[PDB]
Amino acid sequence: ECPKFCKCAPDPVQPTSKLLLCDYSSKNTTITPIASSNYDQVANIRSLFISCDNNNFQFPDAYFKSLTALHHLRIVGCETTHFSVKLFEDLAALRRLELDQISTASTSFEMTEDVLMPLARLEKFSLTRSRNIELPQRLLCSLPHLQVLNISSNELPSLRREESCVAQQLLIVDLSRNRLTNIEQFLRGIPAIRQISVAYNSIAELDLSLATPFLQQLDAEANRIVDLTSLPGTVVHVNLAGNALKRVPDAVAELASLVALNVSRNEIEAGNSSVFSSPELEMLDASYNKLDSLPVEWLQKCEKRIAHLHLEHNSIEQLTGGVLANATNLQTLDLSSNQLRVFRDEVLPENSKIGNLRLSNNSLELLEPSSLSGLKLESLDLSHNKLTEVPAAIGKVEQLKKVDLSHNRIAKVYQYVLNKIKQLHTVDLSNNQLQSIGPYIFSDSSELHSLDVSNNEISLLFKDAFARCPKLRKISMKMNKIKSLDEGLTEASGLRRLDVSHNEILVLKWSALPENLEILNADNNDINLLTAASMSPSTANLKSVSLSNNGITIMNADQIPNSLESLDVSNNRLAKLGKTALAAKSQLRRLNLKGNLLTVVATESMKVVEAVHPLKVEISENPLICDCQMGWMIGGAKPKVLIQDSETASCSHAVDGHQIQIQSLSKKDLLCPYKSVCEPECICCQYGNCDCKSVCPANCRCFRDDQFNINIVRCHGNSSMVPKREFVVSELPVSATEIILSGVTLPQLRTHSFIGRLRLQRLHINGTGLRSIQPKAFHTLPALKTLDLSDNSLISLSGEEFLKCGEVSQLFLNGNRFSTLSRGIFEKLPNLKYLTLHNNSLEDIPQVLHSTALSKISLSSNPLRCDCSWEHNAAEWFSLHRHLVVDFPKVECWENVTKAFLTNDTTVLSAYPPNMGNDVFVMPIEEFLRDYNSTICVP
Amino acid sequence: ADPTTDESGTISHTICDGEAAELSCPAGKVISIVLGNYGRFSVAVCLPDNDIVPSNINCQNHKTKSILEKKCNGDSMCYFTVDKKTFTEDPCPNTPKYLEVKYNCVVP
Numbered sequence A: 001e002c003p004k005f006c007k008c009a010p011d012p013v014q015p016t017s018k019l020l021l022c023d024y025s026s027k028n029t030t031i032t033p034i035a036s037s038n039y040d041q042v043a044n045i046r047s048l049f050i051s052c053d054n055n056n057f058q059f060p061d062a063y064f065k066s067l068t069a070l071h072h073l074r075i076v077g078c079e080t081t082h083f084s085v086k087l088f089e090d091l092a093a094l095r096r097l098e099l100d101q102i103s104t105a106s107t108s109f110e111m112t113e114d115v116l117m118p119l120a121r122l123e124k125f126s127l128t129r130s131r132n133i134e135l136p137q138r139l140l141c142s143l144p145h146l147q148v149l150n151i152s153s154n155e156l157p158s159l160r161r162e163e164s165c166v167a168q169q170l171l172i173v174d175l176s177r178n179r180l181t182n183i184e185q186f187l188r189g190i191p192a193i194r195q196i197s198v199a200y201n202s203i204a205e206l207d208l209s210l211a212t213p214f215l216q217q218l219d220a221e222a223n224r225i226v227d228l229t230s231l232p233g234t235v236v237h238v239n240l241a242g243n244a245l246k247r248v249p250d251a252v253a254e255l256a257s258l259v260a261l262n263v264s265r266n267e268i269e270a271g272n273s274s275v276f277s278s279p280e281l282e283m284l285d286a287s288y289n290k291l292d293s294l295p296v297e298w299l300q301k302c303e304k305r306i307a308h309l310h311l312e313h314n315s316i317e318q319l320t321g322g323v324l325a326n327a328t329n330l331q332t333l334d335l336s337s338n339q340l341r342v343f344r345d346e347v348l349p350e351n352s353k354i355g356n357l358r359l360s361n362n363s364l365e366l367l368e369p370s371s372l373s374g375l376k377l378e379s380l381d382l383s384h385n386k387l388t389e390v391p392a393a394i395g396k397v398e399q400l401k402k403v404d405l406s407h408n409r410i411a412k413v414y415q416y417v418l419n420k421i422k423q424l425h426t427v428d429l430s431n432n433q434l435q436s437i438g439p440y441i442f443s444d445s446s447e448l449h450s451l452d453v454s455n456n457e458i459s460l461l462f463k464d465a466f467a468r469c470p471k472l473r474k475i476s477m478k479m480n481k482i483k484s485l486d487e488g489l490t491e492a493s494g495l496r497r498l499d500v501s502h503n504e505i506l507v508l509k510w511s512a513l514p515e516n517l518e519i520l521n522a523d524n525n526d527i528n529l530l531t532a533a534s535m536s537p538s539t540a541n542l543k544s545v546s547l548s549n550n551g552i553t554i555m556n557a558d559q560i561p562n563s564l565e566s567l568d569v570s571n572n573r574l575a576k577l578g579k580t581a582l583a584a585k586s587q588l589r590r591l592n593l594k595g596n597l598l599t600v601v602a603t604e605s606m607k608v609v610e611a612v613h614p615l616k617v618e619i620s621e622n623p624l625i626c627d628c629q630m631g632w633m634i635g636g637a638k639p640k641v642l643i644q645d646s647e648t649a650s651c652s653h654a655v656d657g658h659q660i661q662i663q664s665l666s667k668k669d670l671l672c673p674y675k676s677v678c679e680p681e682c683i684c685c686q687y688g689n690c691d692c693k694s695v696c697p698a699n700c701r702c703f704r705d706d707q708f709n710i711n712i713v714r715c716h717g718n719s720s721m722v723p724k725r726e727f728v729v730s731e732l733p734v735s736a737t738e739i740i741l742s743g744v745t746l747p748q749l750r751t752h753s754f755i756g757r758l759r760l761q762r763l764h765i766n767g768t769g770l771r772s773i774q775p776k777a778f779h780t781l782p783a784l785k786t787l788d789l790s791d792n793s794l795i796s797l798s799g800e801e802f803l804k805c806g807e808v809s810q811l812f813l814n815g816n817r818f819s820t821l822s823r824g825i826f827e828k829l830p831n832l833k834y835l836t837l838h839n840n841s842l843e844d845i846p847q848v849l850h851s852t853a854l855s856k857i858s859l860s861s862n863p864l865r866c867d868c869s870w871e872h873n874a875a876e877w878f879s880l881h882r883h884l885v886v887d888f889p890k891v892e893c894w895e896n897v898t899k900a901f902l903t904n905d906t907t908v909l910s911a912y913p914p915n916m917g918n919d920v921f922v923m924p925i926e927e928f929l930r931d932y933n934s935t936i937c938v939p
Numbered sequence B: 001a002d003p004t005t006d007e008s009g010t011i012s013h014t015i016c017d018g019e020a021a022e023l024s025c026p027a028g029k030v031i032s033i034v035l036g037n038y039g040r041f042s043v044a045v046c047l048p049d050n051d052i053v054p055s056n057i058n059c060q061n062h063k064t065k066s067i068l069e070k071k072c073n074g075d076s077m078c079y080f081t082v083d084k085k086t087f088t089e090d091p092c093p094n095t096p097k098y099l100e101v102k103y104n105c106v107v108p
């Protein structure tokens, strides 16, 4: 079994053995010894990888035991300051050690000369990406059998070695990515070296001809090299990119068998033409340089052997012809980012194998018709240039497979240019100045795959433009003036993704499309109409379509193809959505109604006939109404349409119109008003006097829910044209469950006004001027629970008006003329919990309120008299019940100081000076009860 | 209660149980019974003076319209007493009933 926190594997280098991959980054748990796990294949572990990300990770001294067949060991990310010497004793079969990230800017690591003493047979030693390390000067003396040395990405400022240490098997040295300025002391006395990578350093003077005489590959990229001193005559790869070169260094131009030379991103001049010596130079990359024109002294020796010429970001003004006319092996020629104006005919050889020709971002004005005669090009680039058409030098190649002619000034595309090349896979004619796309300019290119004419002026599409190409599958026409899609694409039945976004297309015909299109994009146009997607056969293959930022105002069943899997009609003017638009389109999975002007998105427009999947919808940013038809917005239906942006999608309320979050939309909000309707199973619906018939009275708004459980009637006499008639209650619907007659003028409640309303739950006849209430006016209301007679002209209430209303628990009598509370209130309101009597004319606390079950009660803005308790005072009931008052800091003691002197009804409050302008002294009720025994009531 | 005519000229009438029913049309016209039902479709109409709210408001006598058309049609005025004797059956026993009749006055 594989040990703790480690996973076995069959060794890749030797698939018969067993690799092990340790990851102790997970936790600070203990490090299980491998010898004590006694893994069944410890002598089959030839390569061993450990990976950490925790700091100060120290190996147990008895960890690498019994791994006596371990050949490779990789340690990645297990930081420390030194390893145990005992650890590396039992690993004499180790042939390849790798360390990676064992120290940061903080931890200092020292490779000990004794930790590596039982590691002589190490044929590869790798220690990469780690800062502030110290290596022994006798590092090579502990590891003489050393062949590949990698210590890159370590920023070592110097490398010093004791001169007695000779790595006589050192083949490949990796000093790359450090801070080394001179290392002669290290390389002095290590001659076996054939490959050096001192890349990404600060080396200033390099001397190697008498140090490493077999050096075969020199990588000196990103240094301070001004000119070299000496090399061994074996150098075949010189990489001097990013140095301080001002001309060709001599010790590189004298090379014997130099195969490749990358002296790019320097500041070389092509005036200082040193003569190249090697005829084996087969690839030359003098890019990102300061060349004025290609020197012939350079290529002088390898004319039939040069193959790849990358020469970008120079200042070549003109290819002085003849220099490349003998490069028969030239397979790649890169001359982008220069100042060429005419690519003349005498520059290239007649039968060059040129498959790559790159000339982008030039001032190219003319390609004479013979510079590309007979070529077998695969890739031809000529972007950001000054071409005036497609030049006939391009009619001569027949193997041309990819072409880029963007950001040019092409005004027209003829027939013969781009027809005579059958092998053309890809064309680019974007950002040009095409005025239209002429017929048969694209027929005989029967290997076409992608076509781009985006960012042009195309005002018209010819009917025959796209025939004779059963392989063209992708075309882009974004940002043009396509005002109509007639005729032009009906014939190309191999197209799959078409781009006509950001145009002037007014109406969308599906029949005006190809028949195998699978992705469509018609974004940011003027499209305002969708044709019959049911009488159009070129819809069966459409999968995704985006008509965002358009003008579609309606979508029905016939305008939405049934085989689309994605639909994006966002930022449109969609007010209606046909009431079966998504019914028979069982394949759709996403739906974007973002930014439309939809109001009532009915339930039937989203009910998908046998949808197996969740239908995804974005319906935010729409002036919706949350009525009973938005039942699917709660998500209790199948198909269970899931609103994506319910966390920001909002709607207005159905009664008042305040903002509701669709995520927190409940079954309670969904109200959809009416003026007349009938309940289920209602038999008399045709008649005038019918109980289940809910007929709305005049000046009343009537709402309801889906299942005839809610019935809101909210009438208002907010008419400046004052109701010159009382409110006739006998006109209201019978089955009403909430009634608000608020603002209307109704001074009297007759006997039996509200009889037989078993469903009624709230009754707010407030703001009607009700002076009198005839008894039994509230007759048989078993579900009645809240009554509001506030803000009228009632002065007292008996208890004979309240017949059979036991469920009543709220009664609002504020804003009236109430001075007395009878006992008849609590004999018929047992469930009474909430009561308001504030702002009235209550002179004292009614002695019915000493043994009542009220929990909240409001008794402020009432002229209450406060004496020192002749047993019934106000401050005596309040100090006992001041919790029952909701507005305790709002009750105030009153005493008419002018009346109590003339009536000799002397109370404790007529001895304070009354308020200026008043006969009454006013003191908050908390100030009387706190100052009860302290100052006021002291005899 | 009193007969009421709507905007389309149909006169309705609501008459309690045991009371006298009088339908009448102006000169030159005859009664044309549009609807007819003897039973109870409302809690509020013809209240029993005993304070017993009627629990049966889906009470229907389907023979009412046909018995009123054979009695009042073609005539300028119709008289009878509203009880269970005139409409042949009690459509909801132990529920107070009333005839609700709507009628048009057409030229013969």
Ligand SMILES: *[C@@H]1O[C@H](CO)[C@@H](O[C@@H]2O[C@H](CO)[C@@H](O[C@@H]3O[C@H](CO[C@H]4O[C@H](CO)[C@@H](O)[C@H](O)[C@@H]4O)[C@@H](O)[C@H](O)[C@@H]3O)[C@H](O)[C@H]2NC(C)=O)[C@H](O)[C@H]1NC(C)=O
Residues within 6 Å of the ligand: A241, A262, A264, A265, A285, A287, A288
């Ligand atoms: C010889 O030395 C050369 C030094 O000039 C080495 O060149 C390196 O090439 C790589 C590969 O491109 C660069 O990495 C990136 O290159 C792209 C190239 O342009 C692409 O992207 C732009 C848009 O960004 C697009 O317009 C083009 O059409 C290309 O598709 C750069 O745009 C990136 O920013 C990035 O630089 C290296 O940066 C570049 N230099 C170095 C120092 O790495 C060359 O690789 C050497 N030869 C060999 C065989 O390795």
Ligand SMILES: *[C@@H]1O[C@H](CO)[C@@H](O[C@@H]2O[C@H](CO)[C@@H](O)[C@H](O)[C@H]2NC(C)=O)[C@H](O)[C@H]1NC(C)=O
Residues within 6 Å of the ligand: A288, A313, A337, A338, A361
């Ligand atoms: C297009 O070519 C021009 C050549 O003039 C490039 O301009 C130079 O770009 C180099 C980057 O290597 C800068 O160091 C120079 O300073 C630029 N020359 C100026 C500013 O005169 C340009 O960058 C090229 N662009 C592309 C996309 O190829």
Ligand SMILES: *[C@@H]1O[C@H](CO)[C@@H](O[C@@H]2O[C@H](CO)[C@@H](O)[C@H](O)[C@H]2NC(C)=O)[C@H](O)[C@H]1NC(C)=O
Residues within 6 Å of the ligand: A790, A791, A792, A814, A815, A816, A839, A861
């Ligand atoms: C106490 O109740 C009275 C009556 O409900 C309120 O007086 C009304 O005030 C409004 C606006 O202030 C007027 O439109 C009405 O005409 C007034 N009605 C009467 C009968 O005067 C009074 O505002 C209430 N006070 C408090 C503090 O709520």
Ligand SMILES: *[C@@H]1O[C@H](CO)[C@@H](O)[C@H](O)[C@H]1NC(C)=O
Residues within 6 Å of the ligand: A100, A126, A128, A150, A151, A152, A174, A197
């Ligand atoms: C040296 O090691 C690093 C990381 O282990 C690796 O990215 C780099 O390519 C290596 N260089 C060699 C083996 O020359």
Ligand SMILES: *[C@@H]1O[C@H](CO)[C@@H](O)[C@H](O)[C@H]1NC(C)=O
Residues within 6 Å of the ligand: A322, A323, A325, A326
């Ligand atoms: C190419 O090689 C031929 C070999 O005879 C030589 O005559 C000619 O000068 C060379 N250069 C050009 C540009 O033709």
Ligand SMILES: *[C@@H]1O[C@H](CO)[C@@H](O)[C@H](O)[C@H]1NC(C)=O
Residues within 6 Å of the ligand: A740, A742, A743, A764, A766, A767, A788, A791
């Ligand atoms: C009557 O009470 C309702 C609450 O049901 C309230 O919204 C309305 O403002 C009140 N009427 C007046 C005229 O204050």
